[model samples]
Target: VNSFSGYLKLTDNVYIKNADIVEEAKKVKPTVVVNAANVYLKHGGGVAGALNKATNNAMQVESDDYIATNGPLKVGGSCVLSGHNLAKHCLHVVGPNVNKGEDIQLLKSAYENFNQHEVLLAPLLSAGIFGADPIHSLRVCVDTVRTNVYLAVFDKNLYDKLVSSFL
Candidate 1:
């Protein structure tokens, strides 16, 4: 049972919420739900796994077909997928693997590709098992985030810290 008081609307459309990203997506029903995806768009673990599960493996099947059709997504690249039971569409974005010495620019590039949506929902890419620092990654997300984006923060500590910093 996590405690999420609600969202803090920083701008007219940009919002920050301390909640599970998947749940947030279901609630908000944004135009697109961004997945912190691998180059292959495989929905194996972390947020990807959860999203796939929520969609009843439809996301995984669609991803498999996507890779079979267009090839694996390159790091910092993005592709659109059927949202299945979630949003209208799912945007699969590959964040840089910092453990491999990838620069922050690659992460920014992922955000740069999200230009087709009126409303977007996303998690902190590269900040999970990929090894990017949460705070730094969050800053990048907020700084380069498109208009009408909702940031769903999964970690309670990170969410509190960000809210505190913003205030």
Candidate 2:
């Protein structure tokens, strides 16, 4: 059994592969909000199966109010891209699996869209859009916008670039 109370958290600016997301979220509260894509199951039940199978489900317990919105750009299937929904509610943006140029435009659009609402969550990288190496994607996300940017990733190198780009 995992002891949640006694867990000593490690905070570092560098990234690691497959770091514990829940723990990180707890450590970096208020500044960052983690948004995950609800992957559809084999039978088309979106997030239902995974939600039922998790060990300790807190998303439902944490907040009562919830809103799920789709983006204007539909790259694949019925999903309208992750960045679109995040931009409206939070000041963050995620890119869909598209061309490099188009991806950059989507990130910029998210910033613009969220700015109108006056709610600014840190900018995020859609893990699905980029491959194993995220340097290119991070470059695009940082270059287009001039502000305090935040990204959630296990890779330390990528995180360093994100911080340095603004400075």
Candidate 3:
């Protein structure tokens, strides 16, 4: 766990730029790496899609299997996958989307699913195409996360701005 207030790093692509997420995962070897997924398991772009491609569609298959067995996550729902692709385990949590009315509680609830790990790598959820508002999401994360976090940009001056805020 980090002792610094805003230890998160504002870096290049979370998955697509050049680094192999799986290799990176094996290096840091986090107990769980996070991927932002939607109800339908859509793997077109965003974090979810990037993760899917990075893991050789390992996360994609896992999400598809989960959705096939049960159903898509409703507006505030989430799921997890322990597949051995990108890392030791990958958490598939949900976030409020354009249609979900921008609720932070729902995002917090989704993150609440995991608590038993030393390290967790999370994407900059709900900020990109989802457009769910980054500042509010970051606030909820600061309040909800039970573990110490190391920052991973998941943007731009936005990351710096968040670090300046309640971070």
Candidate 4:
């Protein structure tokens, strides 16, 4: 993925903002930052990894504690943790994996969990290692986000696509 640098409005309450995950975590500082977390909340790669580094790896410790207490999160499941940095809390949601026969509803459920907060910020979930279609994830974000939200994107093509044809 690439870093993006502008904003594209899709609806009254939805927006596609050009940002890398960690940049938005440290700079934008929304009420709740979102992580495209794995089922075990390992914070290993992609969004989870970025947030882990941004929080000085404190999030990984928190996630470990959470998993120890609650076990692994299922597909579409999520939990919250103290951000310990710019954002107050961080949300970890496990998106579905297509290789495992999971589908769009689980992806949609991840976005649904994301919107539980007032002001939310997140990157596209399930589209990386989770093997989700970015276009469907974008649509899910548009359909699910109710309050003011900035869904971060790191790709210029996605930003352009959203600007040109999405509404």
Candidate 5:
């Protein structure tokens, strides 16, 4: 098993979870779950794609097409989606194609789009498809987000590192 202990509550809604992303969504039952939708609201790959799939390709109507009317979402921009199995709402946050810590301010823009809610959930975004380091994403995704955010942890070793850094 992992060396990590358990879940962490940095504040009321901000959390670190050693669980699957989908599992965390289920447990938290957040008012909304955040997604990293790239420019143009491309919800066809990465976590956004998975979330789109979860919502029965909802982005086609619920997000992509809708946001298209608003014009392209800039890096660290976002929109919302509905009709998903996991959560009642989903916030599609657009971030850099590849992060290098230069877009710390850009990343936080996603949070700015929020009207605000009790809880939100997302993984270490941009680390896989966009090539940011997981730690790099953690720095932005966890620390800067003001609403109660649930961060996904799939690996035991990384979990240890994350827990250590925050605690």
Candidate 6:
């Protein structure tokens, strides 16, 4: 599994930018590529209003049939549980509001679902939810699955923070 994390401008044409990333990934011949960025596709010129358009395009390129002949597929989403179309399979695990341990619970559920016998791919934790401390998120994800896992962070700074937090 391959994972990617980066800040893409979310504007009227932001989803197009994501599409470009997926197209680029397909050229590399990887088996599977997952995008784990926590984007607000509704803000500004974001894809909030264009999810159907974006997801429709994504479905055409990343579907199981597409991957069988193409390569890997990109997956991601926004804050809302049922809005936006970032990829082929979008898993929405509920999180708690303020002070609640909802984030932990959400992570746990994601871990469990990703590791279940039905799911063969690794879980992609959201960088936005964990902020710059991806390690904490990674730890939570790793602990939840109790097996080797994969994660993507926005950058080197966040990646370092994640590693340092564990130390």
Off by over 4 Å in 5: 1-6, 11-13, 99-104
Which 10-residue window of candidate 5 scores lowest in summed lDDT? 1-10
What is the Cα-based lDDT of residue 13 in candidate 5?
51
Candidate 6, residues 115-165: lDDT per residue as tens digits?
432222222353343332344455656556543333333345655555555
Score every model by TM-score.
0.89, 0.41, 0.75, 0.88, 0.76, 0.41
Per residue, candidate 5 scores C-alpha lDDT tens digits across 82-143 of: 73777778777766665444465565565566436656666766655777666766766655
Q: For each candidate, C-alpha RMSD in Å?
A: 3.7, 9.7, 5.6, 3.9, 4.8, 11.9
Candidate 4 least-lDDT 10 residues: 1-10
TM-score of 3: 0.75
Q: How does each model score on lDDT?
A: 0.80, 0.32, 0.61, 0.77, 0.66, 0.34
Q: How far is candidate 2 from the true structure (C-alpha RMSD, Å)?
A: 9.7
The best candidate by lDDT is 1
Q: lDDT by residue for model 1 over 1-167, one digit each (tens)?
A: 12233778776556788878889778767778899899988888888999999999989988898889888888999998888877888998889978778777888887776656666788878877778877777667667776567778888888888778763
Sort by lDDT, best first: what order?
1, 4, 5, 3, 6, 2
lDDT of 3 by residue, 60-124 (tens): 77777878899887655556677465567777767777665667557777656545555676655
lDDT of 2 by residue, 32-142 (tens): 232423222111111221222231433333221222233232321122222221122212223443433344444444433323321122324444333212555455444
Q: Least accurate stretch of 10 residues (summed lDDT) in model 6? A: 9-18
**Which structure is stronger by TM-score: 4 or 6?**
4
Q: For all candidates, what are the clash counts?
A: 0, 5, 2, 0, 2, 4
- Superposition error at 142 for model 3 (Å): 0.9
Give me the runs in candidate 6 sitting further than 4 Å from their true place. Answer: 1-103, 117-124, 129-133, 146-148
Pick by TM-score: 4 or 5, better one: 4
Q: At residue 34, what lDDT does model 1 achieve?
A: 91
The C-alpha stretches of model 2 lying farther than 4 A from their native spots are 1-21, 31-94, 98-105, 111-124, 128-133, 156-167
